[PDB]
Amino acid sequence: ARGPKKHLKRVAAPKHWMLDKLTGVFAPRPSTGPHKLRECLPLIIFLRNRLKYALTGDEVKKICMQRFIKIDGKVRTDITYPAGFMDVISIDKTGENFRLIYDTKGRFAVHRITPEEAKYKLCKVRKIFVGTKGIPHLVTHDARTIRYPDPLIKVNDTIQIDLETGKITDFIKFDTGNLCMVTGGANLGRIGVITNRERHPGSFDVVHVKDANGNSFATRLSNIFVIGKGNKPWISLPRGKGIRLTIAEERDKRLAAKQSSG
Amino acid sequence: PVARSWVCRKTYVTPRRPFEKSRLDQELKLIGEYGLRNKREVWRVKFTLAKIRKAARELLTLDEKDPRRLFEGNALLRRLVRIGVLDEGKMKLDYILGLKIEDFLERRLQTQVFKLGLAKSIHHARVLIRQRHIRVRKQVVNIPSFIVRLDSQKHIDFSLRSPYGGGRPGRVKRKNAKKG
Amino acid sequence: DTVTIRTRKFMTNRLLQRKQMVIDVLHPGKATVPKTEIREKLAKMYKTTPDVIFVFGFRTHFGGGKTTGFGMIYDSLDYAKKNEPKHRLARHGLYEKKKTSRKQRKERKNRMKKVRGTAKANVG
RNA sequence: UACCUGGUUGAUCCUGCCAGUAGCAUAUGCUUGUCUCAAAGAUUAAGCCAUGCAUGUCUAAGUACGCACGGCCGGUACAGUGAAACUGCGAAUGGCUCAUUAAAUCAGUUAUGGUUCCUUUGGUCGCUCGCACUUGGAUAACUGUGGUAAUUCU
RNA sequence: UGGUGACUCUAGAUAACCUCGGGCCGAUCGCACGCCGGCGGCGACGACCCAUUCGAACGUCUGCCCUAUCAACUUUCGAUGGUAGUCGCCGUGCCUACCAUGGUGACCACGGGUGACGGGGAAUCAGGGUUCGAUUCCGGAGAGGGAGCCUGAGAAACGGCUACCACAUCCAAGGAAGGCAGCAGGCGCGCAAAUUACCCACUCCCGACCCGGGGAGGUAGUGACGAAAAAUAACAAUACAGGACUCUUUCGAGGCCCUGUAAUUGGAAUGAGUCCACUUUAAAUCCUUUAACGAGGAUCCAUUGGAGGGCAAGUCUGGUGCCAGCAGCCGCGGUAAUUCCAGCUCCAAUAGCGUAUAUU
RNA sequence: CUCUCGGCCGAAGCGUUUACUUUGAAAAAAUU
């Protein structure tokens, strides 16, 4: 390598894109953007695989360049734009808004939201600096640099922000008894109430989180996204409530579904 | 770099002793009973049975309340029941070891044509299977190794396009009927 | 008479302004049906004219029963000219492909690369 | 399927190897009707290469005075499409081979509080107390004269 | 002010500096046009910096194959450390100057070799293990050998440049031009490996970009590398041959007995092929689907190895006669050859099967 | 196993240090 790589092979592509094995050698290289190449969803994969609107890459070209797709209320024409977590996608022609939220199994679900819900989003604050004549700045997980926040906002908190105005509206503090979602590791997509945060100066803060069914698990601190103040979440949720069904009881549900409709 | 897959398996294992009388004896007996082309078919069924038994051996050694043992074993027992080998009474992973090769050879579509009376010889069953005369539900199957399931066992028919079925007698009847 | 058209998964793309569907064809006696014939079948089925609709990718099933293809139904003809792949337009005579070979167009490109100025237009 | 069989002696019981047995991979022989996948100048020589191709690029949105065109309506600064050329970006991705290389490469793990970063995305873009109702000079494209046996030379 | 586990952090105050090879503070384009002579909405390009994304770059701990006929290695020409600097994007003997004499080693240092690019992984395998990994994914390295650069955010780049070396092309003999370990193709080397095809329709990438380009890639061609399925015949009646059962002292006779063998008879059913039409597709080809012709075995005919033991299947017939030869090993051949060579019969695997080598 | 700071508990030391075991989170896809 003499410079930045620009191609991505299909088998090296993030597994959660559920790409095939046999259509091609390459995968969409997500452009550089507000989200990591692994923790994201290129617009083409969301449009021609999840929704089946387009059938080729060229039909995604024909859709995105007509200016129907909007990510966070701004028209985005890039076909491989990195759309990520807590992300609002709006299509005005069909009049439908989805949110990208992690699935129970760790993938991205297509979660259809109310157009009332599409006006706001949640951003986990990532760092807080004070620059240029005492002006405070937040950097969130979408790289949204926000000047002049609430002084109570500290790192690892969440801020609910408005998409149109770009300003923060209200913040959820990182505290035990707050409903969080996991954004990485084996526990990805599981949603539960924070019980304990343990400190390791030097290394990574491991956090113990109790699920809705009483199945406690743990994560590193960076993989935690806070949503609910208390037990009530600040957003709508997928068809599963974020609880990880184990294999045998999932098969039980499958067999019950076959018995229900025949 | 290509958009292809090279994953492939060999579905038989040749025996280690090449010419021992009892092995050749048993294989030739099964060839006779179930009407097969060569010894590779018997080796194929024996290798599939060895696969199932090896899975059961790996599953017995685990503890009874192991979630992996439970899930894998119950799925395997469901699979062998749906083929038509095990019985609903003996759905235990212990009984999987008590399986024999002919319990899999009885489920071939060749033998299911033979037993159910669709044909009259097992070579006759094979020659009807190859020539597109036997269908399952609504699909004409041409393969004499189709392992027929229990729910699929009930209705095997004449493949209505066949002369034995709906109509259209073949080339021989058509030619002999236009002799004069 | 013995042919029947059924439609599996069906979807209205407002943002591609068409209707896509999966087409099942039943023809227990005949051959694989022509794409033209199924075009008038869908035209009478969806109450539109046959001049705007497109079908492709029909794989007849082993034996000779079902045939499954993909078919998409455009709103007006101009939208069909705008959005369809041009090889599916050239099956209806709506589009004509350039008749030069790649190897010829590339030798010509390197030839006119070797020249500078308006004399790039003269070479052929 | 946690396997063995022949061979030293007059015969036995051994040590013991040789040979058989099965695989898997390259070559090769002989033969080859159907059908679905599918490896393929690695080994020997990281030896040498005739020829063709493999890296280009324009939107309403940098520069149009090529009649090059159908074409405005005519003193209408510039209607449109637009070859060429300047400008900007790419050409550092991809492909290929395994010669080097033995704590090197590489793998898991940590670190940059020791640094660089096109692009993308969000911020910043009258904080500065000091001709603008529009600044200057070239140079291609084109015209015209040429050199050299010869070049993507000029 | 705010923050880390920890700042010589971020922020603030003051004194100053701010390179002529200089740092930012729009002399830019498009779209609709509109309100009290002046004010304006949307978009594109741009920009010092910050944060981000894509990374790159250095460090950390642990983990390599064979070799002692490699036991001491390093340090004059930096080897190990200290202080100050130089260069560097930075941390450092990275380099320089001055000091100190250190650093590694039987827990195998140093030197060699390697038919060594590493890993994910492959084959085998009860358990343990053994062997392999050039090879489509990841990381590395190099474009004939070395070296040095330009431009750029990113290169010590080679489908860029400049040199020397080694080859090598066109000459008008003055000069000019190279780089297939890219795709096809050739020579050469070999035991050993395909088309100088077609297309950007798929997958994705590049650009000023709903448009252009792509030997990346796709698609056909060669392809018994290897892998999956799977034809080369099925039924009935006769005609013999046996086997049991019954009746018969036996010989023999029957069966709504069995089992074989029939260039025997009868019909039906089919696919390999030739060919239309459709479908497939970028256009094709193939597979799949339809009409038409298409099968009696004396062919639309199955091979490759074998018949002494190991090791399945002949002490069958003729030829050669310790010759020719066979035979992995043990051995045979010297005249009834159970082993050679044929025929017949038979065995093993079966569209496959022999041999050689490597490895398990 | 405990003495201080805060709301019966949370902070702070733990305990001579390790080997061992068990759990937890991190550990590329393909292959298995």
Query: Between the CA atoms of A205, A210, A211 and A212, what dihedral angle is there, to the nearest 10 degrees?
Result: -150
- Mutating which of A23, A25, A244 best tests the B interface, going by the most B Cβ atoms within 10 A? A25
CA distance A97 to chain B (A): 35
Q: Nearest CA to B48 among B147, B152, B149?
A: B147
d(Cα A40, Cα A60) in Å, to the nearest integer?
18
- Whether the CB-CB separation of A254 and B73 falls below 8 Å is answered with no
The domain ranges of chain C are: 4-121
Given an 8 Å threshold on Cβ–Cβ distance, is B1 in contact with A9? Answer: yes
d(CA A110, CA A119): 17
Per the CB < 8 A criterion, the answer to whether A162 and A119 are in contact is yes
Contact B138 C65 (CB under 8 A): yes
CA distances from A138 to A85, A172, C107 (A): 18, 15, 57
CA of B41 to C1' of D23 (A): 20
Helices (H), B61-106: 67-83, 93-96, 102-105
- Number of neighbours of residue A171 by Cβ within 10 angstroms: 22
- Nearest-CA neighbor of B102 among B21, B14, B34? B34
As a rounded value in angstroms, the CA-to-C1' distance for A5 and E113 is 38
Q: Considering only CA atoms, which of B129, B154, B155 is closest in space to residue B144?
A: B129
CB contact C64 to B (< 8 Å): yes
User: CA of A63: how far to CAs of A79, A136, A215, C82, in Å?
Assistant: 9, 40, 44, 12
Cα–Cα distances (Å) from C66 to A213, B53, B136, C9, C62, in that order, read: 48, 39, 15, 16, 9
CA pair distance A91, A66, nearest whole angstrom: 11
* Closest chain A CA to residue C71: A55
Give strand letter and number of the nucleotide nearest A15 (CA to C1'): F29
Of C15, C22, C81, which to mutate for an interface test with A (greatest number of A Cβ within 10 Å)? C15
Strands, E assignment, B15-169: 135-136, 139-140, 156-157
Both tokens of residue A126? 């990532």
The total of other beta-carbon atoms located within 10 Å of residue A154's CB is: 12
C-alpha A111/C-alpha A99 separation (Å) is 5
Residue closest to A61 by CA, chosen among A34, A88, A80: A80
Nucleotide nearest to B24 (CA to C1'): E312
Q: Distance between CA C11 and CA C13 in Å, rounded?
A: 6
Which DSSP string do the residues of C80-105 spell out, in sequence order? HHHHS-HHHHTTTTS-------HHHH
Quick one: tokens of A185? 């590791």
Whether A21 and B5 lie within 8 Å, measured CB to CB: yes
Name the experiment that determined this structure.
cryo-EM
CA neighbor of C13 nearest in space, from A62, A164, A4: A62
Identify the architecture of domain C4-121 in CATH.
Answer: 2-Layer Sandwich (3.30)
Dihedral pair phi/psi, residue C69, rounded to 5°: -130, 180
Is B147 in contact with B83 (CB distance < 8 Å)? yes
Q: Classify each residue of A221-249 as buried b or exposed e, where b means 16 or more C-beta atoms within 10 Å of its C-beta.
A: bbbbbbbbbeeebebebbeeebebeeeee
List of domains in chain A: 1-116 (3.10.290.10), 121-171 (2.40.50.740), 174-244 (2.30.30.30)
Q: Domain boundaries in chain B?
A: 18-180
Tokens of B155: 């209705």
Torsion from C-alpha of A181, A218, A159, A95, nearest 10 degrees: -10
**B35 CA – E200 C1', rounded, Å:** 52
Give contacts of A66 with chain C, Cβ < 8 Å: 15
Residue type, A257: A
The contacts found for B164-171 with CB under 8 angstroms, 24 or more apart, are B164/B133, B165/B133
Please name the helix (run of DSSP H) or strand (run of DSSP E) that holds residue A179, with its range, or none.
strand A179-182
Listed in sequence order, the residues at least 6 apart from B133 whose beta carbon sits closer than 8 Å to its beta carbon are: B158, B159, B162, B164, B165
A1 Cβ neighbours under 8 A, 6+ residues apart: none
Contact (Cβ atoms closer than 8 angstroms) between residue A138 and residue A152: no
Query: In angstroms, what is the resolution?
Result: 3.7
What backbone phi and psi angles, to 5 degrees, belong to A128?
Answer: -135, 115
